[PDB]
């Protein structure tokens, strides 16, 4: 259970508050703490204290009282990082808290890399990659549904389901992984008949998951929306009135941005109604819609506040493009309520299984679940007819390898880096 | 030791972090905690737990897992508020932390008024008014010297010294407070000779303190500086290049502002060098200096970047006003280093006793120490010659009343309000 280098970090948000937490972790941490911590009543040393036990004392830079704090000892595996840690919670002043962090840093600790604490929690096996990512997802969450999704993932709901898939991928895999030497007349009395039934129910279980990512990505990172249109359309004017940037409506988040339009849930084409000289740029809107059939298209006719006649003009833009058109005054803010309601339509019209089925989020998992079900189909369709008995065991191990990668069974230490660099120093 | 209404509050700074602390306190708080907290391994209830003991469990809104937290039980008088409190430290996401606070609020707690926690700590007598104010002073501190000053006051250094004054004000006061009935031929063999010596050493001890406020106010709330001059002088241009607003230089803070000039440590008069048509507004600068003799005056000749000749002009502004003049280009930033150095001169030239003498800060204390030494002089000079023996006991009780007010011996519950309204919700 090797401990890491002692590391320290401010664990609470930057700013002014009643209290802050400096948290240190790693090899010999509470011996280090003892050099600077001094118990106020009696001298019960921290290194002598039980886990989950709090101590009121003072921090010192040699006769220089840094602050009055409360030290929380954690021991053994029974901590967040699953190593030795103490957590000073001090007065929540920026100058004070910074002094505390420095004191730790001067007396043995190094500054924590971003997400290193959770990284250690995963590496020590207290928590898995899903759960690790879930911690991050919760802290950054800005929607209720995003928050609730991370709670589920932290609780491990997905991990349970994925563990229930590793089940057959241990069962049916090791069943053929023992063809190594004992292959003379190996059977289980019509055994391959049940193996196909194991895979068919196994692959369909993976498919139920790969499906939820459509809803999941929306809940996690919101409905990605592009605002298109030629210069002077009103793009800027709409953007800041609706609030790279995002806003919330009907418990759903919308990521507004410009430029990769491949992968974009909703396209809003802005064109200045009755103002456009060259109005056959509705040919342009016809070929945006055509180039992104997966997206939801929505034609936003701007500058409705002038020319009070444009009902026929709206219908002409509609008919000429086959898209849906909405009249908008981005300056005044007219019909915006109607535009917003049309935007909230995207989530409403999708699918969504019985709420028991947990939503998979994050591209990484999706792609792996795909890679798994492809290897599963390779065993199902490509191999299961007349093909060999050694190449089939390759595909099954490939699937178990893929399902396991999402939970961290196979550590990539670059998959980890992209995950934890996303975290902030302190977690 | 009457407990207050259970109150809850986010105790950590607003924002995004690894961890946050919701802290609740008051009557029956850990019974309330128990309705929502659920220990993860075993069911050791919080209300059954020892003080200074931490518990890892989950918060719930009835089958709805709010978060995975760690509860810290505090009991009896042995807590910050000196009442029953638990402190949940949860994942530091704004959505999460807010959910936690709501859970507390829905299950018995009310939202804490600002500074109520420290208010309770003072009211329960765990801590005094000085120490109470010191907590605030530390959290808001933005200078090292401001930080170190609050630490001293939190440690109680001033309180010790002031307690050492309450000494004689109990000794010499009750010595004459027993003239109530036992006055027939009361003596202590030439007793009044030592009483004057008690007061003379007592009043001079108060005077040592009233003196430190000159340095103290600077350390606490910084050198208050007014930037004066007629429109188009360059006031705005200087202000934002030097950074209502304040900046730091030579470990000292400068409060820049416009208008009450009564009470202002440093006045900078800006006038556009070589640019001023009506240059006999140096009559105006002569009568600012004359109207505020206590302040430090400093004539700042702006717009030096044009007219490369103004050495003679500088000297003319100098000679015509008897002030010190500095050439400044507020736009380019020339001679600003020289202006800053002249500003740092104010703190350097003052007094400062041997560093053992603690700095009194805060107008409130100052005025009270004055009120005390005035009552002390009333006993010393007004009374001690031929005056009565009943009116002398009035002045001595007045001094003890004044010295005691600064430490909270006499609670004003409006003195308290102005102090704690200054605090933020959570402390
Ligand atoms: N003071 C504090 N420190 C933390 O590290 C922390 C909080 N609070 N609040 C939220 C909590 C959530 N995460 C956890 C998870 C597990 C453990 C832990 O000590 N693990 C033991 C539990 C066994 C037990 O005591 O019942 C384990 O062996 O799993 C600590 C924090 N968390 C971090 O965000
Ligand atoms: N978790 C936490 N809670 C707090 O309330 C708190 C921190 N940390 N860190 C800084 C500390 C400073 N203030 C104090 C002061 C006294 C006590 C206290 O429990 N008083 C007992 C001490 C006796 C003992 O255990 O030795 C007393 O009777 O005076 C708690 C916090 N503080 C708040 O800002
Ligand atoms: N009358 C009117 N003018 C608008 C409206 N929206 C934008 N404009 C004007 O059109 C100009 C360009 O708009 P802008 O949002 O910057 O479009 P963009 O440059 O393509 O992002 C601005 O100077 C606005 O004054 C609108 O709804 N009504
Ligand atoms: N060349 C030059 N122009 C300046 C300087 N300082 C200010 N100005 C100009 O003087 C004008 C008024 O300055 P301002 O700071 O607003 O003075 P205030 O209105 O009295 O606060 C501005 O428009 C500046 O362009 C300087 O140091 N050099």
Residue numbers in the entry:
A (entry chain A), B (entry chain A): 9 to 251, 270 to 284, 305 to 473
Quoted passage from the original study:
MnmE is an evolutionary conserved G protein found in bacteria, fungi, and humans, which together with the protein GidA catalyzes the formation of a carboxymethylaminomethyl-group (cmnm) at the 5 position of the wobble uridine (U34) of tRNAs reading 2-fold degenerated codons ending with A or G, i.e., tRNAArg(UCU), tRNAGln(UUG), tRNAGlu(UUC), tRNALeu(UAA), and tRNALys(UUU). The crystal structure of MnmE from Thermotoga maritima reveals a three-domain protein consisting of an N-terminal tetrahydrofolate-binding domain, a central helical domain, and a canonical Ras-like G domain inserted into the helical domain. On the basis of the common feature that the G domain cycle is regulated by homodimerization, MnmE has been categorized as G protein activated by nucleotide-dependent dimerization (GAD), together with the signal recognition particle (SRP) and its receptor (SR), the regulator of Ni insertion into hydrogenases HypB, the dynamins, the human guanylate binding protein hGBP1, the chloroplast import receptors Toc33/34, the septins, and the Roc-COR tandem found to be mutated in Parkinson disease. The X-ray structures show MnmE to be a constitutive homodimer where the highly mobile G domains face each other in various orientations but are not in close contact as suggested by the GDP-AlFx structure of the isolated domains.
